[PDB]
Amino acid sequence: SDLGKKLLEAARAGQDDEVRILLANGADVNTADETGFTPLHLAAWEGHLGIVEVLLKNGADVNANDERGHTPLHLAAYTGHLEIVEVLLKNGAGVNATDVIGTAPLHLAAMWGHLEIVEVLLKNGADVFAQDKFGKTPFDLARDNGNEWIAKLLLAAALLEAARQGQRDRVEKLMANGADVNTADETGFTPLHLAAWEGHLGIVEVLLKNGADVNANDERGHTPLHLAAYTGHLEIVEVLLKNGAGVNATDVIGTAPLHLAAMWGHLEIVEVLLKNGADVFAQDKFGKTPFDLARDNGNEWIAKLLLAAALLEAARQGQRDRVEKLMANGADVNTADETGFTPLHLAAWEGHLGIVEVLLKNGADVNANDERGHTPLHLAAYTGHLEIVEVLLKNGAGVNATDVIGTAPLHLAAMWGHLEIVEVLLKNGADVNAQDKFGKTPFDLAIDNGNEDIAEVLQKAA
């Protein structure tokens, strides 16, 4: 067609008026020459933006193919016409269309070093892994042609996507070629963020061996450990912790990994976070603790566990207010750690008289035994806390309780030179003749430790 021929050349020559006159005269907007080039092809190749937009407004096929599989987007990517690339994509151009050789627009922008075009193509979903007929990726071409900044950009985008998808072999080869293991997307997520979010234990391990920053923050302050505590990946939480992950990292909302674990019902992850130093008392902007979030979400099994851990620590530490506030929240007064120590055990050992009274006032077991038979009175007699010894005895403490070795409170008081406690125990019915499993009486122990005055008292009482 002569009209079509006139239109093709009018578009190739940048004659904006001629194009409009010819379209008004019925010229086929999608005419093709001997090799399949349409007016939109030629306008994109020659960089005539106005015509590109006119042809599209008149029904030009944005993805028209020449005989070799080139689209208008291929040609704009080749010639470096950023604005035409942007307009073509707006109108539905195939960002990943491949020619007969498997070449995509991203290959061409990387091959010829069009940085801004590479960035726009990636933003529009360009496939960084696309290989042409010869197995070349856009990165390979960038490197082959010495476009080193674009090559690193392609490595970064690839590593972020490979990490998210769990493609170990890809991740390894990307870092072998110099991929930045600590790159980030627009949100601030690093490859480690994405592997932990998606639950790829193998990738997390490989990333960390290659120097991944375990405490990378995103825009909102989220750490990889935050994400693993959110998603519930126990082993990943463990691996992150072993590699220096911060147990109490905080985000803009004030939430720590323990907040996330407790909110999303990850009991095992709460236990691991506690065992690794998680702060049960931390608070977020809304003014809530990990315990508060667990109770609201119906996880009493987690709420109680947080109360248990907090009570033992606060009882040991001597923090009376926390104890009283934890009792008001329903903390188990008789909870025990792995050794069997209750809050009362730990308050007596440390000499925290006030706390002893509170715990007893709230139903604490005055004769609770640890795994070895030590009662709270045993520990008070050991450390020499006269007031605590008297409070315990007043509350029904067993003055002659024997541990697994047959040791009684009087043995310990005599062995460690607490005369005033000896007299108190004797006054409360302590058995001066009790022998431990080695045949030792309190008298005998006082002698072995050079406590003359106590030995004299114990002898007369016999």
Numbering used by the authors: 12 to 473
Published text:
In this paper, we present a strategy to fuse specific, high-affinity protein binders to obtain multivalent or multispecific scaffolds of predetermined geometry. DARPins are used as building blocks to confer the desired specificity to the construct. A series of rigid connector modules replacing the DARPin capping repeats allow to combine the individual DARPin domains in such a way that their distance and angle can be altered to test different geometries, bringing the binding partners of the DARPins into a defined spatial arrangement. The two helices are not just joined end-to-end, but instead the two domains are made to overlap in such a way that the joining helix is stabilized by contacts with the domain cores along its entire length.
D12_H06_D12_H06_D12 crystallized in space group C2 and was refined at 2.3 Å resolution. In the D12_H06_D12_H06_D12 crystal, both the N-terminal and the C-terminal DARPin units form similar paratope-paratope interfaces with two symmetry-related molecules each. To accommodate the capping repeats packing against the central DARPin, the inter-domain angle in this DDD construct widens from 120° in the model to 140° in the experimental structure. The rmsd for the comparison between design and crystal structure of DDD constructs with H06, H12 and H15 ranges from 1.5 to 4.2 Å. Considering the elongated shape of the DDD molecules, which amplifies the effect of small deviations in the connector, they agree remarkably well with the designs.
